[PDB]
Design a protein around this ligand. Structure first.
Ligand SMILES: Nc1ncnc2c1ncn2[C@@H]1O[C@H](CSCc2cc(C(=O)O)cc(-c3cccnc3)c2)[C@@H](O)[C@H]1O
Ligand SMILES: [Zn+2]
Ligand SMILES: [Zn+2]
Lengths: 115, 296
């Protein structure tokens, strides 16, 4: 029944005041893209930075299994758009946030489906 | 001025000289370009390389196959692979590799010395950032280096599709005469210096549209001396200007034809198509790769 909980460990280390994971791979792009969360090519809008997905994934970066029966990563090989105000901790951001499954935006950072 | 280009390619007249090798002494050796906020050198460098490759007649087939050697960083990520994946058409098969472990956006990653890498298929584009810092020995003769360059020359000759292209990092001290000689087996070649790293003697040796036969005879010792002479007498102004306009960055999906032909079937009509970036010659089977593991 024992399973390492890296997501909780990272969140707790963040709350404890620890420096976020660095060297996430920021891309050059136009910053006129769709603004959607996880895309096949950089899609940052004016308010976002685009990063290489694997470098923003806690499980890729820590060399630990992905928490899914299928050991699948939905960031690896894609680009993740991070609000510029959160871009100092892309890994923490992708851990703590959810993609709206109808519009593809981050809940609370672009998804207007609830208005 | 060339400060708005992604970089500077070695002018043809310098290729035609017969210089003797001397020490590389760059006027701008000390300086650094000012990168956009939070952008790392390796992203900027690969972006400018890809912007320059956009000006060449690269073959871009459906189901393009690209392999990237030396793709790891000492941070355990692959920023050059991330730029390549941004640049290449969606659905391009991208494989990368490095001696040291790293996490990557490539479709598949092999860890180990590049000499352990084997592939069944041929490739449309080979990128190499491999570099051994122990070559930068200013206190001995600068001779042609072997190591990974030996592998790269064989890999080009065995596993690069006709019409395919190459970009292999060299420096003043990290270079190989046979690789320069192999440049004469493409329809065109150059040594390209990124504007962001112009204070370094690094360049990318680019072979454009592989022909599988010597089109030109190139003496590799002479050519590297020619390259250093060009660098020594042509200071390149450091510049990140081209990084701010990415509107035309993606590689144009040309849908270049892929055919399987046998050596005796290569017309000069075929050689012309190859030379123009209009044909890739390889089999189109499944892509299978592997890494040799030495057991104790
Ligand atoms: N035979 C080979 N097979 C497979 N991979 C290979 C092979 N040789 C090299 N590599 C990989 O190429 C990438 C680029 S070299 C980056 C670098 C630059 C500098 C620079 O510029 O001063 C300096 C260093 C460096 C290295 C060690 C200690 N102190 C400084 C490294 C790397 O991740 C290497 O692991
Ligand atoms: Zn992952
Ligand atoms: Zn929504």
């Amino acid at each position: 029944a024992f399973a390492v909980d890296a997501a909780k460990a990272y969140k707790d280390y963040l709350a404890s005041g620890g420096q976020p994971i660095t060297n996430c791979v920021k891309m050059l792009c136009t910053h006129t893209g769709t603004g959607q969360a996880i895309t096949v090519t950089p899609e940052a809008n004016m308010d976002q930075e685009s990063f290489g997905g694997a470098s923003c994934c806690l499980y890729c970066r820590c060399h630990i299994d992905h928490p899914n029966p299928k050991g699948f990563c939905d960031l690896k090989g894609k680009y993740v758009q991070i609000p510029t105000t959160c871009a100092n901790d892309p890994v923490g951001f992708t851990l703590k946030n959810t993609v709206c499954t109808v519009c593809g935006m981050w809940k609370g950072y672009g998804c207007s489906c609830d208005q | 001025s060339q400060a708005w280009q992604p970089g500077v390619a070695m002018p043809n007249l310098y290729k035609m000289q017969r210089m003797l090798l001397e020490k590389c002494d760059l006027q701008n050796y000390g300086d650094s370009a000012t990168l956009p906020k939070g952008i790392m050198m390796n992203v900027a460098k690969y972006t400018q390389l890809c912007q320059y490759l956009n000006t060449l007649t690269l073959a871009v087939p459906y189901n393009m196959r690209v392999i990237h050697f030396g793709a790891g960083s000492d941070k355990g990520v692959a920023p050059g692979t991330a730029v390549l994946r941004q640049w290449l058409p969606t659905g391009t098969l991208l494989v990368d590799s490095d001696l040291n472990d790293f996490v990557s956006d490539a479709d598949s990653t092999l860890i180990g010395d590049c000499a352990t890498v084997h592939t069944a298929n041929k490739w449309d584009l080979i990128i190499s950032d491999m570099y051994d810092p122990k070559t930068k020995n200013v206190t001995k003769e600068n001779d042609s280096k072997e190591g990974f360059f030996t592998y790269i020359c064989g890999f080009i000759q065995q596993k690069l599709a006709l019409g395919g292209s190459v970009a292999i990092k060299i420096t003043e001290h990290s270079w190989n005469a046979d690789l320069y000689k192999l440049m004469g087996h493409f329809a065109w070649w150059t040594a390209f210096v990124t504007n962001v790293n112009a204070s370094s003697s690094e360049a990318f040796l680019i072979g454009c549209n592989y022909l599988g036969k010597p089109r030109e005879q190139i003496d590799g010792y002479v050519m590297h001396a020619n390259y250093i002479f060009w660098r020594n007498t042509n200071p390149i102004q450091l510049s990140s200007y081209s990084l701010f306009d990415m509107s035309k960055f993606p590689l144009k999906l040309r849908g270049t034809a892929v055919m399987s032909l046998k050596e005796g079937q290569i017309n000069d009509m075929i050689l012309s198509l190859l030379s123009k970036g209009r044909l890739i010659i390889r089999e189109n089977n499944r892509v299978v790769i592997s890494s040799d593991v030495l057991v104790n």
